[PDB]
């Protein structure tokens, strides 16, 4: 029985165990997955011992994604550009492969919502770690372009440079934005009372698809705002979560499981 | 879904309980939580959010003992708690399953404890936690020995009323026993307790709370004097886990399957 787990601190709000337990039951795999809380500076050592007792792979959440990045012998290209790792896997030869499934998780979620990125104009709001981790996979879907935006133009351009070798990626400050986009993806954080960054509503259109990485009961404040100006379809990041997990499950084992059932289940509990 | 966990500073419990979960088709999740502040705080919060029970690793077993609203006979005697359970009335029950795990492992290995002569090497927390359960099996006698005699004598007088129990220093041990149980740490430092191997006989059953790949240091030593059967503590670990699982779910899970899986992980 292969062992898998999720290392982080804290782990109280981790859906991974619940998620991967259901995938294993749907695809009947001889595996176990558990949540292991680890001391702020004990990930490296905690990780070493894990692969010793028969650990085949594991997810890494805050705040060990960067430390895991260094811990991995070889990193996938998507992980290299991401600068962080959320999925480790001990290969057959012995070494440990680092990877990041954020991007693909987003892409597979979009496809599930019947959103095609082929030849589309994409607007990525924000340029932090979340935004960084989704670029490459978005580009691979071959869109017309991807525009990265932040309040400060500086941080937006740097990010666009890093992935310039995979597609058409532009950068612009929020005050510059003056056109609509086919698909808007928000990676920024909003306050608990619903205050969003100062972005001109020109970005939205009647045919625009809006995807917000945040999720919760009903619609997110960002999606509600998109709908006030025309948004044709609003989606939250709950699918992305189930997606990225699904991608890790595929990586270790070799079969992508059905999220439909799981995503639905996670949402009922979320709405409860 | 019912939430369970294990609190500790550094475990196999999550793996172990998750398998019991599968086997018994129990809708529950078992996680490994960090211990900041203190256990008491983490614990209050844990049950305050819906947790139904948890395991406690060293050195929080004594603090878990105080955290419990009501203790079980075996927990009170052991002086420590490795298992906490929230009852239907909101009260938190504290119990200690280490001794029952040892006993069941021994019985599973076809070892007769009733009317047997036993030598318990050590007088720390591990020894104290297994005395009551051993005494309930009605052995002819239990000899508590420890490097520092005083502590062995104090432990023997503490449970004198529950059965035939006497203490002796290592130097005094000059006779063989039916069952020899090693509860000391000596092995961690790669050392053996200063005891004359005469204690081992060809009929002797040696049980070491320690476990690992191959035979333990203490058991290799027992084998150097023709013991009848040398056993490690892996069965104790799986056994204490199972008792806690029964305490929380009302059903008892199978230990063979799990014990064999863990054994495979140890052997490379
Ligand atoms: N395998 C593993 O990784 C794990 C194993 N365990 C088990 O749990 C138990 C926890 O120990 P616990 O009893 O609570 O610890 P304590 O410190 O409370 O007691 C240890 C006892 O062992 C005796 N002892 C220790 N070292 C020596 C030595 N070199 N020579 C002779 N006697 C010695 C001590 O005698 P004195 O009173 O004279 O000092 C003491 O009575 C251990 O026995 C261990 O087997 C626990 C966690 C991990």
Swiss-Prot record, chain A:
It comes from Vibrio cholerae serotype O1 (strain ATCC 39315 / El Tor Inaba N16961). NADP(+) binds at residues 77, 126-130, 150-155, 237. The active site is at residue 65. Keywords: Amino-acid biosynthesis, Aromatic amino acid biosynthesis, NADP, Oxidoreductase. Homodimer or homotetramer. NCBIfam families: aroE (TIGR00507), PRK00258.1-2 (NF001310). Its EC number is 1.1.1.25. Belongs to the shikimate dehydrogenase family. Pathway: Metabolic intermediate biosynthesis; chorismate biosynthesis; chorismate from D-erythrose 4-phosphate and phosphoenolpyruvate: step 4/7. It is an enzyme of class 1 (oxidoreductase). InterPro entries: Aminoacid_DH-like_N_sf (IPR046346), NAD(P)-bd_dom_sf (IPR036291), SDH_C (IPR041121), Shikimate_DH (IPR011342), Shikimate_DH-bd_N (IPR013708), Shikimate_DH_fam (IPR022893), Shikm_DH/Glu-tRNA_Rdtase (IPR006151). GO terms for molecular function: NADP binding; shikimate 3-dehydrogenase (NADP+) activity. The keyword Oxidoreductase applies. Shikimate binds at residues 14-16, 61, 86, 102, 219, 244. The gene is aroE. It catalyses: shikimate + NADP(+) = 3-dehydroshikimate + NADPH + H(+). This is Shikimate dehydrogenase (NADP(+)).
Curated annotation (Swiss-Prot), chain B:
GO terms for biological process: amino acid biosynthetic process; aromatic amino acid family biosynthetic process; chorismate biosynthetic process; shikimate metabolic process. Its EC number is 1.1.1.25. One of its GO terms (cellular component) is cytosol. One of its GO terms (molecular function) is NADP binding. Keywords: Amino-acid biosynthesis, Aromatic amino acid biosynthesis, NADP, Oxidoreductase. The active site is at residue 61. NADP(+) binds at residues 73, 122-126, 146-151, 233. The keyword Amino-acid biosynthesis applies. Pathway: Metabolic intermediate biosynthesis; chorismate biosynthesis; chorismate from D-erythrose 4-phosphate and phosphoenolpyruvate: step 4/7. It catalyses: shikimate + NADP(+) = 3-dehydroshikimate + NADPH + H(+). Involved in the biosynthesis of the chorismate, which leads to the biosynthesis of aromatic amino acids. Catalyzes the reversible NADPH linked reduction of 3-dehydroshikimate (DHSA) to yield shikimate (SA). This is Shikimate dehydrogenase (NADP(+)). The lineage of its organism: Bacteria, Pseudomonadati, Pseudomonadota, Gammaproteobacteria, Vibrionales. The gene is aroE.
């Amino acid at each position: 029985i292969d062992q898998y787990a999720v290392f982080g601190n804290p782990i109280n709000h981790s859906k991974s165990p619940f998620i991967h337990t259901l995938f294993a039951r749907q695809t009947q795999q001889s595996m176990i997955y558990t949540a292991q809380c680890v001391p702020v500076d004990g990930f490296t050592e905690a990780a070493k011992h894990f692969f010793a007792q028969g650990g085949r792979g594991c997810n890494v959440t805050v705040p060990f994604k960067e430390e895991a990045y260094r811990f991995a012998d070889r990193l996938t290209e998507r992980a290299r550009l991401a600068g962080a790792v959320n999925t480790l896997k001990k290969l057959d030869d012995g070494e440990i492969l680092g990877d990041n499934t954020d991007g693909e998780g987003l892409v597979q979620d979009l496809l599930a919502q019947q959103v095609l990125l082929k030849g589309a104009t994409i607007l990525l709001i924000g340029a932090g770690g979340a935004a960084r981790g989704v670029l490459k996979p978005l580009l691979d879907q071959q869109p017309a372009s991807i525009t990265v935006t932040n309040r400060t133009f500086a941080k937006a351009e740097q990010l666009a440079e890093l992935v310039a070798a995979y597609g058409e990626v532009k950068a612009q400050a929020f005050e510059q934005l003056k056109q609509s986009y086919d698909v808007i993806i928000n990676s920024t954080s909003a306050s608990l009372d619903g205050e969003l960054p100062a972005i001109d509503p020109v970005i939205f259109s009647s045919r625009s698809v809006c995807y917000d990485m945040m999720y919760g009961k009903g619609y997110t404040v960002f999606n509600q705002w998109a709908r006030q100006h025309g948004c044709a379809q609003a989606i939250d990041g709950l699918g992305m979560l189930v997606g990225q997990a699904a991608e890790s499950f595929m990586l270790w084992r070799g079969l992508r499981p059905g999220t439909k059932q799981i995503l639905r289940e996670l949402r009922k509990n979320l709405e409860g």
